Design an enzyme around this catalytic site. Sequence first.
Site, PDB file in Angstrom:
ATOM      1  N   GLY A  62      52.684  47.651  46.066  1.00 50.92           N
ATOM      2  CA  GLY A  62      54.027  47.427  45.563  1.00 50.92           C
ATOM      3  C   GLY A  62      54.812  48.676  45.239  1.00 50.92           C
ATOM      4  O   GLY A  62      55.581  48.684  44.270  1.00 50.92           O
ATOM      5  N   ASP A  85      48.254  40.832  40.746  1.00 53.49           N
ATOM      6  CA  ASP A  85      47.498  41.018  41.974  1.00 53.49           C
ATOM      7  C   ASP A  85      46.085  41.438  41.602  1.00 53.49           C
ATOM      8  O   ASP A  85      45.873  42.128  40.603  1.00 53.49           O
ATOM      9  CB  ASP A  85      48.156  42.060  42.885  1.00 53.49           C
ATOM     10  CG  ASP A  85      47.618  42.021  44.305  1.00 53.49           C
ATOM     11  OD1 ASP A  85      46.384  41.951  44.479  1.00 53.49           O
ATOM     12  OD2 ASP A  85      48.431  42.059  45.251  1.00 53.49           O
ATOM     13  N   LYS A 160      56.345  34.259  51.373  1.00 47.72           N
ATOM     14  CA  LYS A 160      55.840  34.667  52.677  1.00 47.72           C
ATOM     15  C   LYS A 160      55.661  33.441  53.564  1.00 47.72           C
ATOM     16  O   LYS A 160      54.998  32.476  53.176  1.00 47.72           O
ATOM     17  CB  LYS A 160      54.511  35.397  52.490  1.00 47.72           C
ATOM     18  CG  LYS A 160      53.974  36.154  53.689  1.00 47.72           C
ATOM     19  CD  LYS A 160      52.595  36.713  53.351  1.00 47.72           C
ATOM     20  CE  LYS A 160      52.121  37.731  54.360  1.00 47.72           C
ATOM     21  NZ  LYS A 160      52.885  39.006  54.259  1.00 47.72           N
TER      22      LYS A 160
HETATM   23  N1  LIG Z   1      45.304  34.586  44.391  1.00 46.97           N
HETATM   24  C1  LIG Z   1      45.935  35.767  44.519  1.00 46.97           C
HETATM   25  N2  LIG Z   1      46.696  36.182  43.486  1.00 46.97           N
HETATM   26  C2  LIG Z   1      47.352  37.338  43.595  1.00 46.97           C
HETATM   27  N3  LIG Z   1      47.363  38.198  44.616  1.00 46.97           N
HETATM   28  C3  LIG Z   1      46.604  37.782  45.632  1.00 46.97           C
HETATM   29  C4  LIG Z   1      45.855  36.589  45.675  1.00 46.97           C
HETATM   30  C5  LIG Z   1      45.179  36.583  46.942  1.00 46.97           C
HETATM   31  C6  LIG Z   1      44.224  35.604  47.361  1.00 46.97           C
HETATM   32  C7  LIG Z   1      43.375  34.808  47.618  1.00 46.97           C
HETATM   33  C8  LIG Z   1      42.290  33.906  47.863  1.00 46.97           C
HETATM   34  C9  LIG Z   1      41.445  34.077  48.962  1.00 46.97           C
HETATM   35  N4  LIG Z   1      40.416  33.303  49.239  1.00 46.97           N
HETATM   36  C10 LIG Z   1      40.154  32.258  48.390  1.00 46.97           C
HETATM   37  C11 LIG Z   1      39.053  31.418  48.662  1.00 46.97           C
HETATM   38  C12 LIG Z   1      38.762  30.371  47.835  1.00 46.97           C
HETATM   39  C13 LIG Z   1      39.542  30.117  46.718  1.00 46.97           C
HETATM   40  C14 LIG Z   1      40.614  30.908  46.426  1.00 46.97           C
HETATM   41  C15 LIG Z   1      40.949  32.000  47.254  1.00 46.97           C
HETATM   42  C16 LIG Z   1      42.033  32.858  47.011  1.00 46.97           C
HETATM   43  C17 LIG Z   1      45.542  37.734  47.592  1.00 46.97           C
HETATM   44  N5  LIG Z   1      46.398  38.467  46.809  1.00 46.97           N
HETATM   45  C18 LIG Z   1      46.957  39.773  47.130  1.00 46.97           C
HETATM   46  O1  LIG Z   1      47.999  39.614  48.069  1.00 46.97           O
HETATM   47  C19 LIG Z   1      48.266  40.928  48.603  1.00 46.97           C
HETATM   48  C20 LIG Z   1      48.723  40.906  50.052  1.00 46.97           C
HETATM   49  S1  LIG Z   1      49.461  42.500  50.512  1.00 46.97           S
HETATM   50  C21 LIG Z   1      50.856  42.595  49.361  1.00 46.97           C
HETATM   51  C22 LIG Z   1      51.756  43.808  49.512  1.00 46.97           C
HETATM   52  C23 LIG Z   1      52.914  43.824  48.510  1.00 46.97           C
HETATM   53  N6  LIG Z   1      53.883  42.713  48.804  1.00 46.97           N
HETATM   54  C24 LIG Z   1      53.568  45.213  48.532  1.00 46.97           C
HETATM   55  O2  LIG Z   1      54.622  45.378  47.889  1.00 46.97           O
HETATM   56  O3  LIG Z   1      52.899  46.125  49.089  1.00 46.97           O
HETATM   57  C25 LIG Z   1      46.979  41.752  48.418  1.00 46.97           C
HETATM   58  O4  LIG Z   1      47.191  42.874  47.564  1.00 46.97           O
HETATM   59  C26 LIG Z   1      45.994  40.759  47.783  1.00 46.97           C
HETATM   60  O5  LIG Z   1      45.154  41.415  46.836  1.00 46.97           O
END
Ligand SMILES: Nc1ncnc2c1c(C#Cc1cnc3ccccc3c1)cn2[C@@H]1O[C@H](CSCC[C@H](N)C(=O)O)[C@@H](O)[C@H]1O
Length: 279
Positions: A62, A85, A160
């Site tokens: 960010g 995050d 997104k």
């Molecule tokens: N739940 C969340 N809460 C918060 N953030 C989260 C998540 C998440 C997830 C998940 C997840 C995955 N499998 C699962 C399997 C089972 C159950 C639950 C599950 C949840 C990812 N992210 C963040 O999204 C960003 C994308 S790049 C942004 C770039 C940014 N926009 C910039 O300015 O650079 C990254 O930094 C990443 O860490």
Amino acid sequence: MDVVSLDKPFMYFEEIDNELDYELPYQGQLKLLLGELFFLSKLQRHGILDGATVVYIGSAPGTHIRYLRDHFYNLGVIIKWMLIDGRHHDPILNGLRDVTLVTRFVDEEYLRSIKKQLHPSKIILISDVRSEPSTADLLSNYALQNVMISILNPVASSLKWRCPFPDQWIKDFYIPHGNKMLQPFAPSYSAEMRLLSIYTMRLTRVTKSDAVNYEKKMYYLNKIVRNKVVINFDYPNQEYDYFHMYFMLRTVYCNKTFPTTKAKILFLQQSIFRFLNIP
Ligand SMILES: Nc1ncnc2c1c(C#Cc1cnc3ccccc3c1)cn2[C@@H]1O[C@H](CSCC[C@H](N)C(=O)O)[C@@H](O)[C@H]1O
């Protein structure tokens, strides 16, 4: 780049009027910065940005968020930022009293608790969460984003939004109503847009035919439209992505006064590029 004469760029997916059979330094922070400057400036024009709290989920690293704050802080718009995050944010976001940095992956239970602590203050949701991704990864991501909206109940949201490819379809799914903003300086052939919604939340079914229509419309955009030079465009750079960026930046507010509109956009672009370290 084939030359073209335009009055205005395509600002939303619905405006793409043709289709085609699919076949910069730190450009990602510039893409996010412009679309979130566009989204939040639209909210400022509706007078609902002010006194609100921006909850940005998936906000790390960010870097660009620092520019977003300073912009609205220097305009005197009263905004609190909550950046959540699991990854650590860019240290450039440190030491800002109006910016809360939260290291945590959000789930339903944790969205409930942040709604409790922010209620009854206006919430503005910006989600950029991502778990190459599969269609199941996307469906879960979009499910989580619907859950963000049903719990946080934001007065507006930017989500997104990239439709799953038709050759990787699984099932029909539902996304909020809203305007699908097109992103300048997106990757060369990305089909990602930002779903912008202002709530006065009705869900929309997305089908495999929609996925085909997205794929072909976005390919025509990336192959044909974005590779044009807008020769009537009075600007130092006439490539479509700059023509596109120009029309987004003219919705942005400035405390400073400029002799012309072109002078304002040029100043803003210089400011944005300089902070992001782009020549
Ligand atoms: N739940 C969340 N809460 C918060 N953030 C989260 C998540 C998440 C997830 C998940 C997840 C995955 N499998 C699962 C399997 C089972 C159950 C639950 C599950 C949840 C990812 N992210 C963040 O999204 C960003 C994308 S790049 C942004 C770039 C940014 N926009 C910039 O300015 O650079 C990254 O930094 C990443 O860490």
